[PDB]
Amino acid sequence: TTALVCDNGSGLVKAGFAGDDAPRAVFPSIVGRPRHQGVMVGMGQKDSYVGDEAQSKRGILTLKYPIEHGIITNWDDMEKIWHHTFYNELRVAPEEHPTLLTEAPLNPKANREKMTQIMFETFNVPAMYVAIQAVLSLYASGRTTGIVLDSGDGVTHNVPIYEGYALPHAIMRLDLAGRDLTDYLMKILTERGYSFVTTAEREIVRDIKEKLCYVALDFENEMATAASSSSLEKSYELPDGQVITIGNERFRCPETLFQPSFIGMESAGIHETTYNSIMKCDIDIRKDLYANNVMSGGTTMYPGIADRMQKEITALAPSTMKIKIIAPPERKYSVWIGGSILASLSTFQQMWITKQEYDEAGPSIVHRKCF
Amino acid sequence: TTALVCDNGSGLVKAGFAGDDAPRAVFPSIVGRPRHQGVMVGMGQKDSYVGDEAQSKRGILTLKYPIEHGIITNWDDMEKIWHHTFYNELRVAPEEHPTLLTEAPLNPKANREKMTQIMFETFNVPAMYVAIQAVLSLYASGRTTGIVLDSGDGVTHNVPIYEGYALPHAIMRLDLAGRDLTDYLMKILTERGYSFVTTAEREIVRDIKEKLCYVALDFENEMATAASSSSLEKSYELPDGQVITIGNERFRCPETLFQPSFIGMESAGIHETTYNSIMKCDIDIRKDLYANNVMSGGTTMYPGIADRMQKEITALAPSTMKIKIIAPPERKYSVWIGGSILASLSTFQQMWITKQEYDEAGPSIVHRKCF
Amino acid sequence: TALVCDNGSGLVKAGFAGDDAPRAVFPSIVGRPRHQGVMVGMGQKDSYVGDEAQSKRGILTLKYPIEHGIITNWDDMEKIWHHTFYNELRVAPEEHPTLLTEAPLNPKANREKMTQIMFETFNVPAMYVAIQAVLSLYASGRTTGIVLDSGDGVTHNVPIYEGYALPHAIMRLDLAGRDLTDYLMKILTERGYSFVTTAEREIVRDIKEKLCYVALDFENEMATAASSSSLEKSYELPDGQVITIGNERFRCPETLFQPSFIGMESAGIHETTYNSIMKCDIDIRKDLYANNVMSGGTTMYPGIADRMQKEITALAPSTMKIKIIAPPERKYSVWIGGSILASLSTFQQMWITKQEYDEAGPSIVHRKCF
Amino acid sequence: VLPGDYVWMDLKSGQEFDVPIGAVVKLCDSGQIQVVDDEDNEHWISPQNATHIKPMHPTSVHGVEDMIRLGDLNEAGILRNLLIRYRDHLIYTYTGSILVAVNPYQLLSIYSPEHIRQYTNKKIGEMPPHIFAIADNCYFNMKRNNRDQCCIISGESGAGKTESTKLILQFLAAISGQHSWIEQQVLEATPILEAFGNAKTIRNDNSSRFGKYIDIHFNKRGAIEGAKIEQYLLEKSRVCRQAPDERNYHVFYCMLEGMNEEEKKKLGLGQAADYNYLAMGNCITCEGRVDSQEYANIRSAMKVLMFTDTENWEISKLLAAILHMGNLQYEARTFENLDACEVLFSPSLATAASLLEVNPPDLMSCLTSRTLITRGETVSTPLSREQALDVRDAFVKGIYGRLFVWIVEKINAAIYKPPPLEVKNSRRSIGLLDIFGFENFTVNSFEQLCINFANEHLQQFFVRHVFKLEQEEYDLESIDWLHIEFTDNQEALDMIANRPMNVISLIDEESKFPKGTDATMLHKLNSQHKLNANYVPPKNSHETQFGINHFAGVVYYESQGFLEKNRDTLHGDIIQLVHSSRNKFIKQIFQADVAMGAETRKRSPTLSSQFKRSLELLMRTLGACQPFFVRCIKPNEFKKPMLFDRHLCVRQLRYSGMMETIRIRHAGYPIRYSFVEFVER
Ligand SMILES: Nc1ncnc2c1ncn2[C@@H]1O[C@H](COP(=O)(O)OP(=O)(O)O)[C@@H](O)[C@H]1O
Ligand SMILES: Nc1ncnc2c1ncn2[C@@H]1O[C@H](COP(=O)(O)OP(=O)(O)O)[C@@H](O)[C@H]1O
Ligand SMILES: Nc1ncnc2c1ncn2[C@@H]1O[C@H](COP(=O)(O)OP(=O)(O)O)[C@@H](O)[C@H]1O
Ligand SMILES: Nc1ncnc2c1ncn2[C@@H]1O[C@H](COP(=O)(O)OP(=O)(O)O)[C@@H](O)[C@H]1O
Ligand SMILES: [Mg+2]
């Protein structure tokens, strides 16, 4: 009875088996539906395309993410995605495998209850557990003390942990991540004439961002060089053969994490959020919280995000403290790599939620069994 | 001297002097050229016809619009319309009058620079400025707070403003207006046996639309009424003596503003876009934005559009707000009226772009001085 | 006559000595625009103070110049003082002595810079700095009693017997109304309600003030909330959205008694009061048991007194009588007592004059006040 | 010191217009002397008051005709010299070449054919000061210089400004030849213009609300050819709004109290307290004036100037239509989320349309709607109540303003003879100006701002003239004037009118800005002029007053009241209603407007804009002529023949701008001596 670890995020779904080294079912989390008219009688027509097959027939479908900012909005598309993950990707019957799920630290309490109900009734898993992504990131990084800066495409949360002990009052949740990072590049790309409006063209803007966007060390000195020459320009080819050119949006797009005022938000940058989260802990924990900054999620994959972060924290911190940013080359999957470790532990097998407990208590047993 | 105001839209050119009540010149923004063989020697030869003279001698010309979806695509032909406006319609020397121009919000950056360069190098204006149309629609409405729906001939944009402050992150721009409406009417008029093809018959179809198209309060009940009876049918006489009858096509053409999927678009209707722009602003602004929906543009002149907008926004909004749609009878010229009001202000006189500043900086001074 | 400016962390209570109620009561906030001004000709201000800053709440960023009793932004503090003097009281600051209030245990620079600014920027003839917990006894018309003052920046206890105070029994806590507002903001993201901006925190504050109470028995109330929906109230947001809250009405006014919710290793208000009384002389304790004064707006939670009496009755000896004095106007007790004190003939010899300030520098306050 | 010496005693009192008063030392005994001042009051000095007493110059004890020769050149020296000459019935005094005239309130026998002949062909200083002496050297100067001349008479309302213009004609008609009809014709236009352009203020019962310019034309050999009356700066805001204790122009009240019942029936007129326009200041009846014989005085003067009875009836119909339209009451409505109006039913609307001779439905849809005309179509737009109570009040002021031009032209059709010198322009003229003066009331408003703004241009005209003349007094003596500073009051003008973002344009800008009020205008004025030395911002955000540092001093205007007086919105529908009227008279006064029927799309000028246009016209007319200045002083507030109020006179001396003349004299070489003086020392 091998356990299943499903790191179902907003944009990408990561699945696999407890014990493996890397996820085996990394596919997007979109559910497309037909938009145009079907003329050819006899063609096999599907009413919903889930996963990688919704990106191939991307020109005749309307793509919709069932998860936004961590919260699940469409509980039927979520069921479709889970069914696809369990049957078409893992090829495992959910009846005979315990399952592990990940959730944002400060999500509404109804979300986890609904996941519990779905997994214990629709799929009838023998055991289940819900974990926090920062703890799994620490497990993957192989550390017991440190603050994680997890950033995916929905939320950007910081969780400080010292010697296996977490501080709930210093947890920061900011709803600014890849999605608005894509929707802002899609808006500032109109200054050069390119107009991407379709939900299928948003997937092209996301690919442009994932391939040509970096984080500048000094924004002013970077703009002064992007406005004085053409050494920062890069090209990209669309699925129809046209070639775009971007000169300064490459480093203007990712900065909305250190400067959320670009998109109309009043919050502070990720560096200031991390500093405020570390400064809300005990005076003793700050020393080894400064040198154990673990960056997780796919949004921390920009070239140069591990140096600007260090520079900002060094500027915000006392000069006698050692600031170290730990960015593993595989932080895009660290949540699942740590979830597998957690699910493969002998001391964790008593922390599962059994079906009998759910039957005798209700959907509210997760609030006491998890976290 | 007195400043000029030129609201050069996609369909019509509204021009005049600052401080007046109405535009002096309102003529189509078309450049026409003969497409046939001139057989009579001695006739007056003209390689081009601009404005009303192209609509008069329209059966022997090809009509072309230099502006499409707000962006000027043919600069040589757009330079003819500005010359026509300055010398033939207004009868004024452009080198002695400041000129105020208008532009849509999310418009490529080089269009405004080329307008500045043309104004300062071809017409040698002493000063100029470029303003957002929706901002001027509030000046014309006598308000400092409100969300404006400006639908002209190329674009349909919403701009929320509160106490003179614009929230740039909530500005939305749809590319769907009275030219897409005209094309859809041309397409669906072929169901009754009328084939309108040429650029000279597209202007006939536009007149048919403007004289016989309205917006249904309940689309699915109006369709049933049209199917049941003939009380909705009206006749229109073509310029040769032929009469055409149209039934449900009178309200099926404006419906695509609320159901953009009729022309194959994936975006939302103008009623849902307004609500999405209101709900993207701050919570303390929404109550004052609901009761201040100012409709501007010539496309908002259909009978019943205000009632349907109020109905749809009332359905989308909580049943405690006071949804009010402000549709002044002169909303087809509100952009020009607001531009004249702005250009007559004493505080605005320090915000022109002088030719000394343009000769010092270049065509990039407009980004630093305008919006 | 004289000016009494009870200058708390959240509200400003200002008026004239000899009056019965404050004249100006406005929020202690300074807002600044954060959006782009597009309409040319509109009158533009770079800062708004008080009820004008809380009216244009959407387009501004609100900032409190005072955190936990200590003034952190002296420029905004000067703006607030100027607004209070000229726009709210309409007085000339150089013609009225001013009485200021401060928490018991604060850094000395906070008190020195108030003196230097009041003498060098507003040119007041004289000024004084008083303790907020002493003016509450003046308002209550008592000479003996322990005062539990709780605003939104600090919570402090000062035992006083027959006009004499025991400085070694003074206990200051940094848990108050602005911590309750943030705990409510944090725990409101458990039903789908996100309040993040500074302008959405003044809404959570109003929700707290209108819907929060103190449960007599926390564990018997958490069970009632689960048992029935009889303890559940609605509230319409400024945009017409109705939000409904349950046990969070009495879980927020619980960090006063259980500060471990916010993550602070400290005793509740009841235990702090008990320790403050027990750190006095054995004969005095009987008079402080029956005269526990309460002042502040964090003492205005429905049920707060009843639970204070219940909790201090279970720690004190069974032969003593515990009485919690909660005046119906405890939100203004500090200002009323300040006006009473500033209207006294004997107090007129205790003003810090301009001549003494010129002679001795801003350090005269540490030897003239308290 | 000695018991017979004149001294400058200073009784220090809490008075804003207090100056030292002259006194003679008498009964010098003991330690305490006694003095009697110029007002015959007795005081005790005491030994502890030695700085109060200061010796008086021998020039200031015997009085001097020209004050610039005074040993004590100060405000006290001027005040006493006037005071000691007024008691001797000497109402005329010079300050350089400026004639100070004091209202006698008494028939003084100094205006006779023997006095006009005594004053012929004699310069200033050869004869004692007189009103003729101003005219004497004004007439002779244009013949020797071939230049136009002008006289500027200014003062408060009641200090003989109009009398001094009548008496400057008495000499001028005789010096040429026969008095002719023009002397008698000009005097008949005064009761006509003083009905349509005068009103009762809080300081006087007959106050001139405009500037009258009697341009007297001459020919070769020096005889009267004709005359032109040019009106400037009319307060058109008074027609629709009067302050407390003030009333509208005299014509309305006079017509109502002097018209027959039958006629008053045809015009639908009754009483005068039943009219909002007339009754607003609660001063329907004014003491000292009877409005029944005043009507007969106007009618008699009209007949002499060839006003036919048909023309009188049509004028009264226009005046009656002005009063009926002011009784219309508007009620706010909402058409469809848009502001709208509805004129409440009243018998005034039926009468006003009948008197204007327009269709009642065409007047109803001309005050509650606006038509926008553009290429290819026309659109009708509703008006809000605040906008409805701006076209009604602009159509009332448009009729009255254009009517007032009609009377002026009709008078000019009887006294002005076109240049008979058609062949060549060889005519010189003598202009006379009856202009108002600086006023600083308890509460000032839009009209006072315009009046004080006009005086800033006039006082700059005075200063530049005084500067020039003193420069030529230096160069005939070969005295090099290059160490003396000659500053002009351009700072005040460069804050009100002659600079970008000035005071007037910010008032104009807020009149058209969306959601613009008086509080918003005050913030606009402060935000631009707070760092200016001539602007005094209000101390709090609740005060509604601002101060401007004029030449006379700081005056505070009340913001509450602007933006309502500064609105003259004549829409294009109003000029089309007149053109469609059966009344041929109202179309005659609107003749220029109906010609440019389609050119009214341009927004109508506001009253501050129209006021500035007339001021530019006036300053251009005056700038082409050599100026003579007359300063008129009223000595009493009760109109008594021989009562001289000191505190009243000092205010008028400061507000006249004449004290500037002393300042340069002190700046230069104040004491001038001849070689014969060197005998002493
Ligand atoms: N190389 C890259 N550069 C920039 N952004 C990236 C890159 N790779 C992935 N991303 C961003 O990471 C987001 C999703 O990362 P992930 O954490 O796997 O999502 P989830 O939070 O749903 O698990 C995507 O929206 C994408 O924009
Ligand atoms: N009465 C009407 N009813 C419906 N549509 C109209 C009417 N009049 C004009 N239009 C539409 O308005 C469009 C142009 O309006 P306008 O806003 O002046 O254009 P632009 O914004 O390009 O200057 C035209 O395409 C026309 O179809
Ligand atoms: N009715 C109420 N119930 C609960 N709390 C309240 C009530 N009224 C005010 N408060 C709280 O009191 C705090 C400020 O109280 P107060 O002591 O009067 O001002 P300050 O602390 O600035 O002197 C605010 O943070 C507010 O949350
Ligand atoms: N020189 C004078 N001699 C006699 N009476 C005079 C003289 N000057 C003025 N008055 C009297 O003063 C009164 C008001 O004078 P007037 O010139 O009408 O005032 P204003 O200067 O306001 O026009 C007149 O009734 C007139 O009798
Ligand atoms: Mg993730």
Ligand SMILES: [Mg+2]
């Ligand atoms: Mg347009």
Ligand SMILES: [Mg+2]
């Ligand atoms: Mg307090």
Ligand SMILES: [Mg+2]
């Ligand atoms: Mg007069």
